[PDB]
Amino acid sequence: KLVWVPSEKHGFEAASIKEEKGDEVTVELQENGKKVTLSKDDIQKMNPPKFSKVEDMAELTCLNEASVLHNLRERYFSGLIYTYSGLFCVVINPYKQLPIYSEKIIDMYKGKKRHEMPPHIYAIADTAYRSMLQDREDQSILCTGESGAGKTENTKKVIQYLAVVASSPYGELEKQLLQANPILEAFGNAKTVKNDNSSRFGKFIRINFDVTGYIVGANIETYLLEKSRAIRQAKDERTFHIFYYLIAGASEQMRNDLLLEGFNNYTFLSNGHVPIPAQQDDEMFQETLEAMTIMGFTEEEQTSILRVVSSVLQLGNIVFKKERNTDQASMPDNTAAQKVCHLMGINVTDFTRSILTPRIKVGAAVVEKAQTKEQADFAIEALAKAKFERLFRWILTRVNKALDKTKRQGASFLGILDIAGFEIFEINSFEQLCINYTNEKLQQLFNHTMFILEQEEYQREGIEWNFIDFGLDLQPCIELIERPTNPPGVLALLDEECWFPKATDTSFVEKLIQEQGNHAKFQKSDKTEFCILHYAGKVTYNASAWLTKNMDPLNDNVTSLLNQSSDKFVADLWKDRTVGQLYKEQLTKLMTTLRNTNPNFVRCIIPNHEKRAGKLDAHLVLEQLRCNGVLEGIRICRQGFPNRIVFQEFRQRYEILAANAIPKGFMDGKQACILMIKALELDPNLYRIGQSKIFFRTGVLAHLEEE
Ligand SMILES: CN(C(=O)NCc1cccc(F)c1Cl)[C@H](COC(=O)Nc1cc2ccccc2cn1)C[C@@H](O)CO
Ligand SMILES: Nc1ncnc2c1ncn2[C@@H]1O[C@H](COP(=O)(O)OP(=O)(O)O)[C@@H](O)[C@H]1O
Ligand SMILES: [Mg+2]
């Protein structure tokens, strides 16, 4: 008489019913005999043992959070990370290597229907691929989840799968495609508390095909590079990989050429050398040079890149003091400035004059004011950030030029999306507002997609669709952020506070409270703080330095020197309105791309916060299924007809417990079923007859596996 009950340890737990009393129930925990008294409302029905480790949970005959968790947990400990759940897929990071990604296995999935194999990322990629050919439509695979859940690893498996089955030992273009992420990760990833290879940018990879299905080219867009990581890092964390690769792996020749000087010598490396376990930075340096070489980067190109990486570190070694009894910046030591100008190809005394005494065009004459130590420090830091962002964008453009070399744009594409999930931190700033905004758009596309798929299924069968679009809940919160006028949203207000002469951050928070103080998803929280109610939680924002972040100011004098650098590469980097405005445009264009594809969702789940293999943290998993919408899904299909079965199938399964309903001889499938149902005296509120299937409530079909 086993049942599921809430457990503070395990999330849910097996228990046997021992006593009832109206709405009360007394139960016996199956693990330790302990007695527990609950409301009948807290009890969840258990599925029969024939569904153990079921590969598609839509097949479950009792849809509830407890039964879902159990199935995911059971498969996981048998080393089975992939599970289907009706209209989307779920993946629990194993935190160890599995024998499931070989060349053999790739060939086994070629051509297969999702349900003819065990669930795998390969099968999502293959089915998306066949649909591209068969329907002449563009496809997308979206990989989502917390830091460390496994989005980047699954993205890379879809690339390596496609480069194998849609090739035209690989061939030049596919060899280069498989090198793109190794290059981008060296420059865009960093060791973080949650992930030793954290993506500090979002990316969307477009792969282009023929009418025939042959890979013809590819293109990559990146989003939200964490520029500021180049300047300072939190406890236990590293900057981008490339800085440790170069310092640890440079030849003696290179060490000299690029004025390199070791781990403890760089203000921009906050924690000096910190190791990544099971990787050595010198070996990694070698993999990264090899990848750039396969990509077609000339030796001089590779060296110019590394010269820039080095100069970013040098900028950080400049020190400004003040003149006696003033605030005016002075540069008593000259050495850092000399080394960096050497690497940047400009003139150290013009560079100095630019930082300390900028000429400012101001109409009625040219003001040449001296800068405070605070001002010169900010300028140098803005410059190192801008310098590195430009370097990443340059590497991205040249990766793209090597990958779109054939000038053929193909017939179709398959896009792969790899962007950070919704996460709440101790501090939530402008960059988190943008990430959390992006996930409002993405989660809405998900609710909407499920909505359209359901509505079409109901339409083709008769029955009876009375829900409004599932994605509409997210609209008020989206509108609070992105609305131009009427009431202007957070972004628009920011953009306006920026053209205000004597505005502060807190000035902005106050105008916000004024115009959105009573918006449904707003809440006043400290004087730069405010809250927004997102799909997955209340988030506290701190608006400190947002005015500056929206504007992203640089010293235009030194910027001008670098535009005329005597080094051709640095010159190219510097070959040339708000940060909020620009990002909104980037996100508008991405959503437009996605809405015009057939999307496949891959929900990545992190098992624990300790990077451990074979340990599942129940409440951590449940919280993640909540952010995803997986639990809204269970609730919504609970209020519907979760079990749906074709006539022919209903016949040859329950003719056992209903043999005498159907007379001997041929009969139409709907006819036979109607008889089987009348022969069941089933309450007409618990089923619906469709064109090809019967639609059952939960868990009407469970009731029949016995009685
Ligand atoms: C019945 N169903 C299942 O797949 N049920 C298992 C299941 C559902 C949800 C979370 C889960 F974990 C699991 Cl095991 C298929 C279609 O039902 C949906 O999937 N809508 C849906 C709506 C949502 C609305 C908002 C947010 C998320 C949503 C997710 N999803 C259709 C099947 O008959 C065919 O395979
Ligand atoms: N399918 C997998 N097989 C083996 N290891 C994995 C798998 N998925 C994730 N990992 C491990 O977890 C780490 C973090 O995964 P990653 O995909 O980088 O996270 P994110 O979702 O933040 O991109 C990886 O470095 C890898 O060690
Ligand atoms: Mg990643």
3-state class (DSSP) for residue 240: strand
DSSP 46-86: PPPGGGTT-SBGGG-SS--HHHHHHHHHHHHHTT--EEE-S
Residue 193 located in a structural domain: no
Method used to solve the structure:
X-ray
Looking up residue 682, the CATH number of its domain turns out to be 3.30.70.1590
Looking up residue 35, the CATH number of its domain turns out to be 2.30.30.360
- Residue 196 CA: which ligand is closest? 2
Give the total number of structural domains in the chain: 2
The phi and psi torsions of 229 (rounded to 5 degrees) equal -55, -25
Quote the CA–CA distance of 228 and 259 in Å, as a whole number: 23
**Catalytic residue list:** 147-148, 152, 195, 198-199, 421, 423
- 60, 71 in Cβ contact below 8 A? yes
Q: At what angle do helices 241-249 and 299-315 cross, to 10 degrees?
A: 110
**Bridging pattern class, strands 139-144 and 412-418:** parallel
Residue 558 located in a structural domain: no
Reported in sequence order, the residue ranges of 508-614 that DSSP labels E, i.e. its strands, are: 522-523, 529-534, 537-542, 598-605
Quote the CA–CA distance of 260 and 271 in Å, as a whole number: 18
- 83, 89 in Cβ contact below 8 A? yes
Please give the distance, rounded to the nearest whole angstrom, from the Cα atom of residue 152 to the centre of ligand 3: 4
Residue 37 located in a structural domain: yes
Q: Is 370 in the pocket of ligand 1 (CB under 6 A)?
A: no
Residue 31 located in a structural domain: yes
Reported in sequence order, the residue ranges of 8-80 that DSSP labels E, i.e. its strands, are: 11-21, 24-29, 35-39
> Rounded to a whole number, what is the largest CA-CA distance in the chain?
108
List the residue whose alpha carbon is closest to atom 24 of ligand 1: 633
Ligand 2 atom nearest to 149, measured from its CA: 21
Cβ-based burial of 518 (10 A; exposed 0-12, middle 13-18, buried ≥19) = exposed
Place of tokens 């002449």: 136
Quote the CA–CA distance of 554 and 576 in Å, as a whole number: 13
- Residue 146 CA: which ligand is closest? 2
Q: Is 195 in the pocket of ligand 2 (CB under 6 A)?
A: yes
- 368, 360 in Cβ contact below 8 A? yes
Place of tokens 């061939």: 171
Residue 210's identity, in one-letter code, is D
Among candidates 501, 403, 381, which has minimal Cα distance to 181? 403
- Residue 114 CA: which ligand is closest? 1
Range of the domain at 37: 2-46
Q: Which of 82, 100, 153, 160 to mutate to test the pocket of ligand 2 (most atoms within 8 A of CB)?
A: 153
Reported in sequence order, the residue ranges of 124-237 that DSSP labels E, i.e. its strands, are: 139-144, 189-190, 198-199, 202-209, 215-223
Quote the CA–CA distance of 533 and 161 in Å, as a whole number: 39
Residue 651 located in a structural domain: yes
Residue 101 located in a structural domain: no
Structural resolution in Å: 2.7
For the chain, the residues before each gap (C–N > 2.5 Å) are 168, 525, 576
- Please report which helix (H) or strand (E) contains residue 277, including its range: none
Q: Is 68 in the pocket of ligand 1 (CB under 6 A)?
A: yes
- 186, 197 in Cβ contact below 8 A? no
Q: Which of 124, 160, 184, 197 to mutate to test the pocket of ligand 2 (most atoms within 8 A of CB)?
A: 197
Which tokens sit at 40? 């009948």
Q: Is 468 in the pocket of ligand 2 (CB under 6 A)?
A: no
Q: Is 153 in the pocket of ligand 2 (CB under 6 A)?
A: yes
Please give the distance, rounded to the nearest whole angstrom, from the Cα atom of residue 85 to the centre of ligand 1: 7
Q: Is 642 in the pocket of ligand 1 (CB under 6 A)?
A: yes
Please give the distance, rounded to the nearest whole angstrom, from the Cα atom of residue 634 to the centre of ligand 1: 7
> Is 152 assigned a ligand-binding role in the annotation?
yes
Residue 486 located in a structural domain: no
Which tokens sit at 381? 């830091």
Residue 265 located in a structural domain: no
